[PDB]
């Protein structure tokens, strides 16, 4: 159904604000293998409409907080984008952990887990936080659509359904299984990537001199247009002055997210 | 990159390699691209006094 | 910016230092596009 049949659970998290225990806000899965900082989480607590709430399991009874009281952080704080099912979509920067936490009347609940969240910048200007403006390249980011795309994960009855988790055991009465969809699949799109400053190009006899003044680490990719290409890949952060030889057979280069420019010498 | 004669003159020679760019739909904004400053870069890559 | 909806602009040269002035056709290309312009093209911006 959609969904009105599932139930959350308690499970082992390493850290729970006093050592280890069973946690309502465990993290079974983290995926951070998209481009612009999106991360997907899969926890031991649900997210629904009765508006965007968090129904967690606690000592048999079932509870409910909103999703403005929840707070997850890796090395800087995150900003949740949406929640659906056991899953959660956020905009997190790079770190070596995901912590998640909240607070009912007096107690604070937490769960931290070692996962290598990673910011995977698009393009050839390796940035850390995206730019105010720039050219538009092709990106894949964990989308916001929660429709059924083809991905499924398993679950079972032990009155209500429960995920087929490593942190819960299996029943012996009857293995009544079923599958439910993962939203927020990694889908295509168009993302905004920074444009480096204009390279300065001084001429010389069968030579070019590039003066480069970057704001961030950037790829310079040069080649000759002949039978022997001599491809030079470099990452450049410091202001640099690189001199290249340029024949009649031709020479092209690429500076960050700029297009390729072709220069040709003559006598 | 900025060359002003006195500290209270009226003219400054600015050769910053400023280049404007086309904006993206969604909201009003003036984009540009220019060089990192040279005052900073010299300040951090200067020899001892 | 100097915006005109279903317009066409011309740059007015002031002589500031490193004064770059241009003009962009095709922004902001609808209503719900940012400038509350009616048009799909010939919305014209002047940056300075």
């Amino acid at each position, epitope marked *: 159904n959609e969904y009105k049949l599932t139930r959350p659970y308690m499970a082992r998290c390493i850290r729970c604000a006093v050592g280890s225990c069973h946690s309502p806000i465990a993290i079974e899965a983290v995926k951070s293998d998209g481009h612009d900082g999106y991360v997907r989480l899969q926890t031991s607590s649900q997210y629904g409409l009765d508006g965007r709430t968090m129904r967690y399991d606690m000592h048999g009874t079932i509870k409910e907080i909103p999703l403005h009281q929840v707070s997850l952080y890796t090395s800087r704080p995150c900003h949740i984008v949406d929640g659906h099912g056991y899953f959660l979509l956020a905009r997190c920067p790079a770190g070596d952990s995901i912590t998640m936490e909240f607070k009912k009347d007096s107690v604070r609940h937490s769960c931290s887990v070692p996962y290598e969240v990673k910011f995977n910048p698009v393009g050839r200007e390796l940035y850390t936080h995206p730019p105010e403006h720039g050219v538009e390249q092709a990106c894949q980011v964990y989308a916001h659509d*929660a429709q059924n795309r083809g991905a499924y994960v398993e679950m079972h009855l032990p009155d209500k359904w429960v995920y087929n988790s490593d942190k819960l055991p299996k029943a012996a009465g009857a293995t009544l299984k079923g599958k439910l969809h993962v939203p927020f699949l990694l889908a295509d799109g168009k993302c905004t990537v920074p444009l480096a400053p204009e390279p300065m190009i001084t001429f010389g006899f069968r030579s070019v001199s590039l003066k480069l003044h970057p704001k961030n680490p950037t790829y310079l990719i040069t080649r000759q247009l002949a039978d022997e290409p001599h491809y030079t890949h470099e990452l450049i952060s410091e202001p640099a002055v690189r001199n290249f030889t340029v024949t009649e057979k031709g020479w092209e280069f690429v500076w960050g997210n700029h297009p390729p420019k072709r220069f040709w010498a003559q006598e | 990159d900025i060359q002003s004669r006195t500290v209270s003159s009226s003219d400054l020679y600015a050769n910053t390699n400023l280049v404007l760019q086309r904006p993206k739909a969604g909201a009003i904004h003036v984009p540009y691209t220019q060089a990192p400053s040279g005052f900073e870069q010299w300040k951090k890559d200067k020899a001892p006094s | 910016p100097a915006i005109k909806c279903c317009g066409s602009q011309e740059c007015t040269p002031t002589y500031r230092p490193d004064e770059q002035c241009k003009v962009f056709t095709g922004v902001y290309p*609808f*209503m*719900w596009g940012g400038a509350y312009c009616f048009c*799909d093209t010939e919305n014209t911006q002047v940056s300075k």
Partner: antibody
Amino acid sequence: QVQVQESGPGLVKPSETLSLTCAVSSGSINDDSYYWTWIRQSPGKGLEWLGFIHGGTGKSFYNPSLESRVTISKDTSRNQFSLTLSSVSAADTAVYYCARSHFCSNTFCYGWFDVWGPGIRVTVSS
Amino acid sequence: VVMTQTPLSLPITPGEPASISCRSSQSLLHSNGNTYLHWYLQKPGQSPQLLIYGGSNRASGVPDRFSGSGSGTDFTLKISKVEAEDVGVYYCVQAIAFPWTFGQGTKVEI
């Protein structure tokens, strides 16, 4: 292709905040170039534009006759689309429709909107 | 804005032409050269569909039994040959300025 349905209540008690929804089945809401509208048909008055919203960069455009009391919203998690209206009158009885736009690559998408919801009767009454 | 649709109805003669007129307060022509007019068809028991947008531009999955043209504010739909299935109501429709008001209705039957 992209079926749309509609839902919500009927006899909302007068002088109140009325509300309905609209779900686009097998289709995208975050897409650009499709804006999604709201329409009524009162007895004899004829059809009417109320408002809409863009899919991506969803900022709305209402009718100043009822801008004080109308509200359109959006929920991408369920691909839904909705309408809220304060201070219902008596003659607002109508068969509400919700509609998608044609692929707005031109200035013609203003008004030439496409596939509908089958309608929801709404009789403000007791 | 508001606009007058004329006649209120016109039921006659399957197998013949026909036409309807629409008069608008301010002109529905814009500086960019485009007559912002739409014509909605409504069969009984279904939601509105279209025949002619832009004053003279047919739709995609439309029959060729139609045509339309106009000037500024005096606009004209013209049905080339009435069929049996064409019973319903026709609407003149406006786009160039909010509020996007629609026509009052012209009922067609046999």
